[PDB]
């Protein structure tokens, strides 16, 4: 379902990381498999060659937390106007307080020890069920 269209029509794009995270760009290939691309450090940008109809999403490279691109989940390069590149502004979402707490707790506790935390089972499961691109693709389908 979610896959890039094989258009072969070039589209130049600026990946602009306006988040404080290290960004992993992910291209959804023609079979819908996520292909990881080189990372962007916080606040950096890359001019890259993509194609019209191609699908991209962006993650925290270390934790796979979700990020937004031009305020949404998916970025699809369009036709370049006047030879100008398309801007893909990558930003933090406003996470729910729960998700943000899960992030911080995940960053401090090794996964083997989530079960040692003194919290209800559902929260242990929430911690173990960490962000993952495949999970989101099924969701987005």
């Amino acid at each position: 379902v979610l896959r890039s269209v094989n258009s072969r029509e070039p589209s130049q794009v600026i990946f602009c990381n306006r988040s404080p995270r290290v960004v992993l760009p992910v291209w959804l290939n023609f079979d819908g498999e996520p292909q990881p691309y080189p990372t962007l450090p916080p606040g950096t940008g890359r001019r890259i060659h993509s194609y019209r109809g191609h699908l991209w999403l962006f993650r925290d490279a270390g934790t796979h937390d979700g990020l937004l691109v031009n305020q949404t989940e998916l970025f699809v390069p369009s036709l370049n106007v006047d030879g100008q590149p398309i801007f893909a502004n990558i930003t933090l979402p406003v996470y729910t307080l729960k998700e943000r707490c899960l992030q911080v707790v995940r960053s401090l506790v090794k996964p083997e020890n989530y079960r040692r935390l003194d919290i209800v089972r559902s929260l242990y499961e929430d911690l173990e069920d960490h962000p993952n691109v495949q999970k989101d693709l099924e969701r987005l389908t």
Partner: protein, 104 residues
């Protein structure tokens, strides 16, 4: 520009915003609306410094880049009971417990 504040007295903490251009007195009017005490019965402070009614919040060091939504700046508050003002007293928040071992 908006500044984001905690106005604090004893065990009372008001979360609100105001304009950098707004005055200390105008902030007392905000406090008046909430806690029902007029400006003449309020003293506002930045740390230990008594704030003058006519000054802007900006002038008194509350700026949009220091008084942030996710980390608001503190304005101290003291009431006058009858003749004289109480001293500025802000009760600390509770202390977090020790980190569990698995978080170290």
């Amino acid at each position: 520009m908006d500044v984001f504040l905690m106005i604090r007295r004893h065990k009372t903490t008001i979360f609100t915003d105001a304009k950098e251009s707004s005055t200390v007195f105008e902030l007392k009017r905000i406090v008046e609306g909430i806690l029902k005490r007029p400006p003449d019965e309020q003293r506002l402070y930045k740390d230990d410094q008594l704030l003058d009614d006519g000054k802007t919040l900006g002038e008194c060091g509350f700026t949009s880049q220091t008084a942030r939504p996710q980390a608001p700046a503190t304005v101290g508050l003291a009431f006058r009971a009858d003749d004289t003002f109480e001293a500025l007293c802000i009760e600390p928040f509770s202390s977090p417990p020790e980190l569990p071992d698995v978080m170290k």
